[PDB]
Structures are given as structure tokens and as C-alpha cells.
Amino acid sequence: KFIWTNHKFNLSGTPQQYVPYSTTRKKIQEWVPPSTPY
Amino acid sequence: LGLREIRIHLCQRSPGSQGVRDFIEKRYVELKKANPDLPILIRECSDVQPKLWARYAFGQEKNVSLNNFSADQVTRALENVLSS
Amino acid sequence: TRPTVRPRNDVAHKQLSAFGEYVAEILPKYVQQVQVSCFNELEICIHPDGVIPVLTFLRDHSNAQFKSLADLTAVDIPTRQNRFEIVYNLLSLRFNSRIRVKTYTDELTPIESSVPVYKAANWYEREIWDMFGVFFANHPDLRRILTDYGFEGHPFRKDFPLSGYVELRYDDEVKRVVAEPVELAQEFRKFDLNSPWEAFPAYRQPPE
Amino acid sequence: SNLIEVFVDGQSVMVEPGTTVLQACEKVGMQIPRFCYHERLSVAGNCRMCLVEIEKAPKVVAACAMPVMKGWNILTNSEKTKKAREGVMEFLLANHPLDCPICDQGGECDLQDQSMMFGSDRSRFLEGKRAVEDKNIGPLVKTIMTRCIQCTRCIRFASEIAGVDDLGTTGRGNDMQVGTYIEKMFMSELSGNIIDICPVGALTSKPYAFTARPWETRKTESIDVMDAVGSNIVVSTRTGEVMRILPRMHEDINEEWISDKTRFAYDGLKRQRLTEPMVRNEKGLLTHTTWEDALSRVAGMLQSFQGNDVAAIAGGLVDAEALIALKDLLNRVDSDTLCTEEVFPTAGAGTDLRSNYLLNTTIAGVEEADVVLLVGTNPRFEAPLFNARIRKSWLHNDLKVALIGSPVDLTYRYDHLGDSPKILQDIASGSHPFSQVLQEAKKPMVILGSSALQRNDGAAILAAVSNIAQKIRTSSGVTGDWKVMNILHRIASQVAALDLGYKPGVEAIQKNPPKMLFLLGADGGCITRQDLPKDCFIVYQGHHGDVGAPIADVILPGAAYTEKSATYVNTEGRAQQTKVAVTPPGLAREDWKIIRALSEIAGMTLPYDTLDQVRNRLEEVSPNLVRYDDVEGANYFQQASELSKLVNQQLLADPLVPPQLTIKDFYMTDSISRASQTMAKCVKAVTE
Amino acid sequence: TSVKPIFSRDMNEAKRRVRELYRAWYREVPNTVHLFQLDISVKQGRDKVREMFKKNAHITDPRVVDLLVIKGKMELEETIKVWKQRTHVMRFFHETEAPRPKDFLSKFYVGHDP
Amino acid sequence: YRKVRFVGRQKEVNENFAIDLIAEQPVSQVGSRVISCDGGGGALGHPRVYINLDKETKTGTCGYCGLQFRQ
Amino acid sequence: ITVDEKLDITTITGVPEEHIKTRKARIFVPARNNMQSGVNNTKKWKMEFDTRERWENPLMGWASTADPLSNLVLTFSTKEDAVAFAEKNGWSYDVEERKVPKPKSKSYGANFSWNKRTRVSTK
Ligand code: SF4
Ligand code: SF4
Ligand code: FES
């Protein structure tokens, strides 16, 4: 287990080229303004 | 307006400035025994040319100097501005 | 101690004490220090005056040949108050030995070319003018080798931040390949490896 | 004349009769490896990793505790010593389980920078390794006791300096643990400072717990301002953010010690923070506007008001370089009536000559002092390092103590003299004793706080206590000069914010209704909008949002204490300049550069741009704020001893009480504390 | 300071020198401006030369004023010949690089803490 | 704002997650005091580390290993 | 020989660019990381400059930067020869001071005492 069944390739656009991204949680957590009341 | 404040700078040594140190002995307790409003300022050391400073008229600085004086020379040098 | 520790040899260390004893004997106008590297090599600390002179004595003699010039180089040390350093390095073909000649300097003080003594310091002196900035006078030619035509910084000295000051990139807005200030895609992380406790007692700096 | 010569490694060196081997062999530049020995603590013998080998005697001694007699030959490096230091540090690697990937000290530990350089090569054991079990103490100290080389450097410290006696040694033989027999959690100030002590990774810090190893960081020295004594700290930066902070081992203030609050409080620095300018809008609407926009909003409104109708008050941790740019600007429109948030009662002094205004005998004075009387304060939770700078000196030589009012829990044996303001007076002559004891004292000392001085009768106790200092000093009064009467503050930047000449106490606004205020104070509950007249606007300036963020007109951001090169002052009147670390987030800018770009867009344009043209101005208005860390000789309280006797005001009657009692209020006080979410974890582990 | 100077002695032969190679530059800007087939107003080429020689003005010393020369004496080797291909030259006049504010309030809206 | 980069690119992300995949393990027991945690097979796995389970009911899985472990 | 004595305070100009007058260097003795007791990381007076902004790079989060010095630490051997290299290259600077402990007086065997107040238990 924990390994595949068939296979894949190295393809140029498959459409899926995987085009990596960032894997992390946010950073500074900006402030929320207060709601409707004065 | 003025005036506003008076800052007597001095030095701890180079006794050539000692008049100021002596001026406190002479007129401070007495000089400021009146004027219970003005907040004259003794700050520490310019080490050289113990320039007296004063500030008034929207924060314009006027700096007299002193280098080597006697005791009463400065006592009369202060009312130069203080009368005005 | 024997199995893993490099076995020493004494004979090589007796002679290079002698033969170097007396080149502080016969040219005292110049040589200001000499010593023996524990591995059986010599270092002759020489004033900047003799450079053409001393080699010329080392150039020919029947007691010291030193015809083969191998490696000229430099080192640049701040907090030596005279920055740079030279190190000449010469092999004497008959007597099988290496004797290196250290001569200090600054940027402003010139040093005089060795080129008529050996013709193989022709390049090694063109280079150093590029890198560190030392200026060798009376040199048949002085030019720019190892570096591009733009570097005005003289890199290998210790003030050049590793990435130089101008990255390069080509743009099609006209037809050239032009130069815009350096903008990286990663910080070049600075790690910090220097561990405490002073593991070397023998080199222990003066007590102070 | 009283010294010995002893040859270390065949080199002569002089040593006072009664220094040990280790303090000699340091003088010539060697470290005998160390485990249980440490300077500031006491000494015991149970590491056995320093074995020096004496010359001509078959035994091998230990260089921690044993004197040095007429000259031995102290032989560090031979084939005898190297037979021991290799043979101990293969013992204490017998049980030391296979951490170091993940032991959070894994980059500094001393089972690591010994046992490569000194000592062994590989191991022969081959099977074994007890593993005991951990427990918990508090939400700081994290405890894996599987390790414990058992120097017993955490234990001799509790019974020592921070006087809380809890930790113990429970057991016999191969098995003894350390942590406490019962379940008692161990919590106090300075006792978050252990985790410098323990040489291996037994005790490691909670909030930091897993974030970064220590070869990656960047040590940029700094100074901590939440409070009087300051510090000397050192920050750290990974990616351009703060990770954790240490002490810097200054030799007077912070011996090696940093307090607890100044350590775990970096954590509310990146939490809730105002990153922009925010415009006014008329409603409860408050919105973000481009930097240029809400600058002029308040620019013109200065061209309206004039005279005392516009007054600014800055009471907080603000620097000593935004206490000029703001003073000269608001004083070049000739409107002053400005003070700080604090309250310093004044009669005939309090600015001039200062003499009573700062702590006179420095921290390093206490070490010599003999008789002490301190009143109206709980020195423990304000300036926590002036406390234990008594404690260590209360021990190690004799010292006497007395407090006035509300007996609290301190760490050492004092005695409550009396509780009321009305006790001070009768001590002028003989009554309610000491009577001669302050009188017979060779170096008396008296310490008044900022909590008691802040009463409504305040100008009396200042003048009532000064008398007893005059009472003694006029006799001799010490030897000698040896100044006596002195004060201690609890607030971060005041002695700067004051002896620049900014009048003490918030009154000058309390008499009239000035329309336009600038709040740098700012979070004290002193001035409200109800107390103000009609909606004429106050402009908040500062980094946080705590209280006074909503009640305000137009706000402007700023940089905290780690982002700006500033100048603070501690209560001996030194000058310590914090240094840049992270560059401030979003759009916020430095404070004294937000003044001059308020000036030029308005009428007057102040006479400087760069920093050095700020401090020359700091140099005119004061001489000693550019003298970094030197205590200049001044007494000058004779002439103010009499002149402050001018007014005759007498006391109130009511027992003195400090604001802080036992703990829970120590944490959330200033600004950053309040928003620090870990304090929010150790405040609820107090109540229950 | 005692060290041998390079070429000059004090300030005069030195400031005869900087006057000198000026003309080698001033006489030859343009032969290149047709040679590389680079197009500019030939007077630009005579503004830059005079823009640079006025730059380092505060120099108080020989062996500095000789040092700068040894650089300046070189360039006329490369440029009066062709060792550069159009793109080692034109880099003097920076075409692409967006302007710097250099004023105050133009900074304060773009960029942190210069 | 940031989110326009993977438009049409299908955004590789991790189908399984180990955030907790651990708790499904039949947390073991021994009947003894201290144990040897060398995991995943001899000489492939974390360095040997011995942990004490004496609490009441807990264990301790050494933190390299993760695999829920107790008596 | 052309010895030609004179005095002109050594300075050098043109090699860096605007970073001559903009910055302020600093000369300081490193403080000993306190998590460990090793005293050998002291003893050399280095220098290191001011820190300017590191921002975030909006693709990954590497913190990319300008300020091309930012990472240099030279190591000098002493103060007399410390300032030697700021003037000679001509930029502004500042100085800190070295620190070493009190003498001090510590004696085991004073820990068991008749009338003294220093008497330890469970050491
Ligand atoms: S804790 Fe100290 S000893 Fe145990 S592993 Fe980490 S470093 Fe090695
Ligand atoms: S913490 Fe680790 S080292 Fe410090 S005492 Fe307890 S066990 Fe020994
Ligand atoms: S270091 Fe030797 S006794 Fe602790």
C-alpha cells in the first residue's frame, strides 16, 4: 500500500503541469474593523 | 512671550567655569526664592563654554555664553534677560 | 600515536633552519623576519623595499638557484593597518625546496614590478590590479583580466558584498542587454557556525 | 604585600591568598571545563569534569573548590589530566538518550561542545539507559527530565537568588529526580529566567518551543523598556521577525539576569497592531486612507487653534527623540500646558537640578549599603532586579531592612514598621524605633516609589521624607558624602520625558478645556472624552490599539521598541540606545520623522532632517542624554533640601497601599503585556 | 605621509594631467558615435565627459589624483579601439531605469525607511 | 488577491493528510516498565530511545515515532 | 629615493557609491550567547553595519533584499587598531566598550556557619 496502482508521466502540459504553489499558513493576520454601530 | 525658561548649562570640572558652580552657592535659593513660577533648568555638562540658554517668543532660542567669570558677574548677567 | 598520525621527518627541518639562517645574514638591509613552518617550509618576511633586489639574489647564485617561479598571490587583511599582502613562491630546481617571500603593502603605496627578473609575473601582476587594487608601476602593460569591463569595485577584497551591485537582464524595449540593480529571489541565508570553547591551547592568544 | 605567585603551566602569575585554581587558571587564558561551577551562584563539587593535575603528588585534585597555596605547578595539559577528563565525559554519556535531533538546545548544548573537543571518541556500553518521567511546572518551563546530567545548577539557584525555596533532590543511588515531590507548580519572577542555567536541554522554553535552531539567527543588541532598570538584551531574527530574546550580561544592571516580563512579552508585539493611517469618518466610521490624505486633515486644524487650546500629553514608552520633535513643534506655535501621563508632585523642584528626581546611589551602591528603609512600595513587582540586588546583598554580607505599610510577601526577613502616612513624621525625633539606628547607620539609605508619591498629599511625603534624609545627612551624615535620599520609578520612559523639561502630572489640562490634544500616553484611563469638552478632536499617535484607539479622531502609526534607533533613560540617568531590528510593518513610520512631515506640510519647518541633526538638538536642550552610560557626579540636593520646604502642606491619613499585590496584576499592565497572548495563558493559571 | 608618489608631485603636474587627457576624450567622443553605429546627439557625448570630470571635485591629495587617472588613462584604450560592443558603452547613459524620487514626500508613499 | 495564479492550473494538494492519521493505531502495551522504540525496522528509523510509561494510562511514543504507544 | 614627507589624513574615494556617507558602522565586542558558558567567542573587536528593511517576496516568502552590504563582519584585534579602518576608508562610525567581570570573592566552606546568615541547606 501507500504506493500507486498504474502510473503517470513527466508531461508537458497535460493540461496538468502542477505549477507549484505555497504550502503555508498565513502570516500577520490583519485587524478586522468593528461592525455597524458607532 | 517672554521669557519662558532658562537653562544654565555648566561643567563638572575645568574650574574655569566655576562661577556658575559658585553662582548656585550665591544666587539660586535666593534668586528663585522669588519668581515661584519660572522653571529655570540646571542641566549637566557642555564641558566648554557653559552657554546659558533661554527660550521665548514661539520657541526662539537665545544663547549667551560665559567662559571664565566671577560670582556676581553672572548674578547680574541673568537679570539682563529676566527683566525683559 | 603512530597508526593514524602523520609521521614526521627531522632531516628536512634541520637544513632549512641553516640555509635560512644566513639569508638574514647577507641581506640585512631588507629582510626583517624569517621562520620555519612546522611542515619544513620557510617564510621570509621582507620589507617592501627589496622585491626586485632580493629575488635577484635568489635569481642566481651557486648556493641558492630558485629559477622557477610557481605561484604569486595575495591575501587581504583588515585590522592589519597595512591592508594587503603579497606572497611570492619559488622553486629551486637543483636543491629541491620551496621558499616563500612575504611582502606587505597598502593600496596607495605602489610596489615595483618583478617583470624583468622573471617573465612569468607578466600575467600574475595584471590580474591583481583588477582584484585587490594594488598598483604595480613600471609594468610593460597594465589592463583588465578575469573581470568584465564594468566592474569598478575590485571584488575579491573584503568589502564587496558577494553578489555584486548590478544584476544584468535583457529587455526588448530597444535592442541592448542592460543593467538594473540586483534583485534576488532568495536571501542567501547566513548561517552561523562558530562554536565556543577554544579547542586549541597551543595557539592561545596572549593573555592580556 | 598579600599575594602568592603560582606557576600555571610553567608561567608565573600573581593570585590573592584564597582564590581557587579555577580563578587563577583563568587569569592566563584557559578554561578548565565546567559543569557545576558557575560564577553568580554558589559552588559545589558534583560534576567532576574539572580535574586539574597538580605537580608531584599522586592524587588528582579538583579545580572548582580548593584554595591555591604557595606556588604549586598547576599542570593543565599532560598525560595525566587527559586521562580523567576523557574518563568522566564518557560516564555522563552513559545515559543521555538519543535526542539531538530534536532537543531544542541542540545547537548550544554542553554535552556537545565539550565532548567533541575534550573527551571521548566512540562508545562502549552497550545496553542500558534508564528513562524517568517528566511532569509539568507552569506554562513556561517545559520539562523533560529524561536528560538531567544532574549538575544541580537549577537547585542551588532557587534557594539562592530568587528566594523561592521549592525545588529539591528526591532519591538515592542511580535514581534521583529533581522536580518537586508534591504537585506544586513553581511560579515567580526571575524564575522564568532559569532556562539560561541548565547546561543541557532538560529545561527549555514554552512559547519558543519549536521554531528555530540557533545557528540561523542574528544577534543585534538592544535595550528593554518596559520598566525602570532597563536591561541589556539581545534580540534574534530568522526571516525578518523576532524569535526570542536573552540577557546580554551587563555587569551592574542585569548581572546575568533578565526579568521574566521583559522576556515572554515580545509575543504581543506581532499580534494586534495598527499598520496604517486611519481617517476620521464622522459616524462610527473609521477607515484607512492614503498617507498623504489624513496628514493635512490635522495640518490645517493646527492653523486654527492657538494658545492653550492645543496641548499634547505623552506618558508612555515613547522615545527621547520624539520628545523633542513634538516639544519644539507644539512649542513653536506657543502652546504648551503639556505633561505626561504620570504624576510627579512638585513644589520647589522636580525639574531643576533634579537631585531628588532620580535614584542617586546607583544599583551598584546597594552592594556597599548597610541600613535600608523603603516606604510605600512593593519593590518586587516593580523593578524586579532592584529587589534581588538587595537579596544577593542581603546575603553574602549582612544588611538590615524595614518597610512602611501593607506587609507583603517579600523573599527575605524584613519587618513592617507601621502603616499610615502619619508614621513618617514622629520618626523625625525618637519614636516608633530605629530612633538611633538610622542615626548610627554608616551608610543609610531611603527609597520612595512612584506609587506612594502619586497620592493627593504627595508633595508632603516628598518633603516629609527628605527631612529625615536631611536629618541624618546634616549630622555627618554618612562618612563622607554618600548620598542618601533617592527615588525609584516604575514607568518606562519618564526620567527622559521629564528632565527634558516637560512639567509633571496631568493637571494643566484638568483646569481648562483645550480642544485639540495629541495622545501618545496613551492608554491610561486618566483622560476620557467625557472629561473633555465638546467633540473637538484628539489625534492618537502610537503603535497599538488598546484603549484610546476607538476614542480618538485621526490616528497615526509608529514603531515599537525594536524597530527604531531611539534613546531611553533608566533611573540612574544613563543613556541607552536601542538599535534597529525588524523593519516596521506595513506603512507605519518612525515617530520623530512623522513630526517633521507634519511640520513642513504646515507652516513652520523644523531645523533638521537626519538623526544626527536630532541629537545635536538633544544636545542643546540637554547635555547628558548624549553621554552614553556614565553616572556623573551630582549631589545638589542641599540647595533643594531647603527650597522645597517652602510650602507647609500636611498629609492625609490613610494606610498606604501598593497597586500590585501578590501576583496576578504583574502581567497585564503597560501595553504590550495586555495584548500578549501568552500572558493571557499565565493569568488564568493564577486565578484557579 | 612618506611613500613614493606615483606620477605627480603636488597638485600641479597632477592638475596639468587631468586637464590633459580631457582632450583625448574631448577630441574623441564622436568618431565612435559613428563607429559603433550608435545614434545620439553628439553633444551628449560632450556633456557626459564634462559631467564626469567635474564629479570628483573635493580630492585633497596627490596619489589619489594620480590613482583616478590610471583608471581614466586606461579607458581610452578600450573605447578608442573596439573592445566594447555598444553595450559596454551605452550603459553610461541609463535609459531604462525608472527615476528615483530623491525628494521627501514622494518617498513617503513608496518604500520603507530609506 | 493572490488567488489568481493557479486559475486553470488545478492546484496540486495532498490528498491524504498525516495531521492525524496516527490515532487509528492499535496503541500497544507491554507489561513492563521501560521500552525500546526503534521503529520501522532495525537500522531504518529513529535512533533508539527508551521511554517510561508509568502514569496510570498514557504511554509516550517518543516523538520521532508518533505511533501511539503505552501499556 | 624620493622620501618626500608630508601629512594628509588618509582617505579614499570613489570605489563604493553612495554608501559612504549614508550609513553608520559600529564597533563592538560580541556579548557571549548565554545559553552556554564558553568564553572563547569574545576577544576580537568586530564591526557590523546598520540594518535596513527586509521585506517579503510575494511568491514564496523568502525575504529578498537590497542593502548589498548587510552581511559583513570584519574582525580586528584591538581598539587602537579598530578605528584605523573606518577613517582610512572614510565613513562614519560609533564605538562600544569591552566588559569583564568583578574580581570576585567566592569561597566554599563559608556555607556552614555559626552566626552567619549565609548557611545553605539541601545544596
Ligand atoms: S539534549 Fe543535549 S545531549 Fe540530549 S541530544 Fe539534544 S544535545 Fe545531545
Ligand atoms: S534541569 Fe536538567 S540539568 Fe538542570 S538540574 Fe534538573 S536535571 Fe540537572
Ligand atoms: S563544575 Fe566542578 S563542581 Fe560543578
Oligomer: part of a larger assembly
Q: Write out the strand line-up for the largest beta sheet of chain G, numbering strands in chain order.
A: 1-2-3
Strand content of chain D: 5-15%
Strand content of chain G: 5-15%
Rg estimate of chain D, integer Å: 29 Å
| Total strand segments of chain D | 18
Q: Name the biggest interface.
A: D-G, 47 and 36 residues
Rg of chain G, rounded, reads 24 Å
Major β-sheet of chain G, in short?
3 strands, antiparallel
Report how far the terminal alpha carbons of chain G are from each other.
76 Å
Largest sheet of chain D: 4 strands, mixed
* Separation of the first and last Cα atoms of chain D: 62 Å
Helical run tally of chain G: 1
The general outline of chain D is globular
Family (chain B): Belongs to the complex I NDUFA2 subunit family.
Protein name (chain B): NADH dehydrogenase [ubiquinone] 1 alpha subcomplex subunit 2
Subunit structure (chain B): Complex I is composed of 45 different subunits.
Modified residues (N6-acetyllysine) (chain B): 51, 62
In words, what does this structure look like?
The PDB classes it as oxidoreductase. The entry lists the keywords Complex I, electron transport, oxidoreductase. Activity optimized supercomplex state2. The structure is cut from a larger assembly and holds 7 protein chains of 7 kinds. Chain A is low in regular secondary structure. Chain A is 0% helix and 0% strand. Chain F is elongated, with a radius of gyration of 19 Å. Chain F starts with 33 loop residues before the first strand and ends in a 19-residue tail after the last strand. The interface between D and G is large, with 47 and 36 residues. The complex binds iron/sulfur cluster (2 copies) and FE2/S2 (inorganic) cluster. Residues 96, 99-100, 103, 105-106, 109, 111-112, 147, 200-201 of chain D line the site of one iron/sulfur cluster (SF4).
